[PDB]
Amino acid sequence: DGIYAAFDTLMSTAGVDSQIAALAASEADAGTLDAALTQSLQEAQGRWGLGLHHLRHEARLTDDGDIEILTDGRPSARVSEGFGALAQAYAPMQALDERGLSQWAALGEGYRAPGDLPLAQLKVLIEHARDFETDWSAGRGETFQRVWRKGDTLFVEVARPASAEAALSKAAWKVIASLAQLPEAHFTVQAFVQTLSGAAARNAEEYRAALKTAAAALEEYQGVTTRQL
Amino acid sequence: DGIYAAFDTLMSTAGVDSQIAALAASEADAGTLDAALTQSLQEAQGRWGLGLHHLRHEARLTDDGDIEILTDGRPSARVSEGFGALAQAYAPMQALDERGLSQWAALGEGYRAPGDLPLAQLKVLIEHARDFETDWSAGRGETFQRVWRKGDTLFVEVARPASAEAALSKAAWKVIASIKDRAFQRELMRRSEKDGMLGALLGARLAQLPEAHFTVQAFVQTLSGAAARNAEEYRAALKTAAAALEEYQGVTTRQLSEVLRHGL
């Protein structure tokens, strides 16, 4: 019960409302819970901005009542170990630049197109290419963006890097106007990823919409976690 | 004359000089031969126009001195069964449209870009997409053409589908012309007016004929590294492979001819 609750907390930093403790309280089957814990972890991975879209992210129930968080099937950390432990197990996988963006390609080693292509070269990729990835590009509001397709799914990302420490500082002096075991000290909402499927993942107007959508998402979620905090 | 010459004869049908019989006899190192069979076999597949780019091809030596032809790691045929045997092992695997073109994608199931794309749009694909594939379009010289990229290698296919029958027909004409004994030439030329040409020339003496089951129908140029992302390297690639396909068609027609002159 501690363990599901703690997980619920971890996801709360990404504005993900996993409801795992409740769903457990409902006597849901172990498979249903696993599925729920994995869906959430992937949803949070999208928004956390750590840059691990190239690894598989899973979370699963263990016999001793723990949750085990894996990456590419390799047991990375446990929740009963604390939010710090998870932070310290993710770190050697990332690779940030000087603005704080991931340097990995979400599609893995391979060719990466300019972030800045004309929207008509982008439209050709979108309509007639199988897989493809672009790199970051400077967008509005100090955010950055990029797009890739993997399978039947087009992935739009909008990312405005911000460290966890600063958000904590803001909400701290905002509460005084009114920490190592807090996940908000390692995890915050930096990015948002919108997905398109089937016909939509080959439609250029649809990609443009999905940009405006992911951009409005990132700003809402960035704010929600600050108001929780 | 041995299983290596049998494999060498089968490779001449795509105009591949494998040199397998000479390697087997050379002072080379153990294992270099299997590698050679597979190298020669894959090149041959590029030219046969069978449409099997999605399968993996291998040839090895077996425990009883035979050469085994593999598809996706599974035993498909044995060289000693003759070349017809190889033809029908490939058949259930193929899928030809009305024109003689493979209906399979070279990249397996997935999206195929149009084959009639505008050059400005095909370029974007060539400079920035990862793996991609186009459909068959027509090209110049009553040819067809498609292009894919798998990895770091661009694959430019030019094809002019033909039945091995017509190829045998075209080689018969070339021979009944070069004939020295003008009397027998006019005899053949008259039977050819009646019973057909390749008909009347065979009639002076085929399923054992390797070219009866395999023919040069296509060619695949390949680009690597920087050229593979270059749209003008692509347009040149297309002219090279059409010239290649004419060449190897010419080589294999002159070969089948010199084969038809034996037994006259």
Curated annotation (Swiss-Prot), chain B:
Biotechnology: The PprA protein combined with an immunofluorescence technique can be used to visualize radiation-induced DNA strand breaks in mammalian cultured cells, allowing the evaluation of DNA damage responses. This detection method could also be applicable to genotoxic tests in the environmental and pharmaceutical fields.
Keywords: DNA damage, DNA repair, DNA-binding, Phosphoprotein, Stress response
Disruption phenotype: Cells lacking this gene show a reduced growth rate, do not exhibit a decrease in the efficiency of natural transformation, but are much more sensitive to ionizing radiation than the wild-type strain.
Induction details: Induced to high levels following extreme ionizing radiation exposure. Also highly induced in response to desiccation stress.
PTM comment, free text: Phosphorylated by RqkA in vitro. Phosphorylated primarily at Thr-62, and to a little extent at Ser-102 and Thr-134.
Gene Ontology BP annotations: cellular response to desiccation; cellular response to gamma radiation; DNA repair; double-strand break repair via nonhomologous end joining
Protein name as annotated: DNA repair protein PprA
Organism: Deinococcus radiodurans (strain ATCC 13939 / DSM 20539 / JCM 16871 / CCUG 27074 / LMG 4051 / NBRC 15346 / NCIMB 9279 / VKM B-1422 / R1)
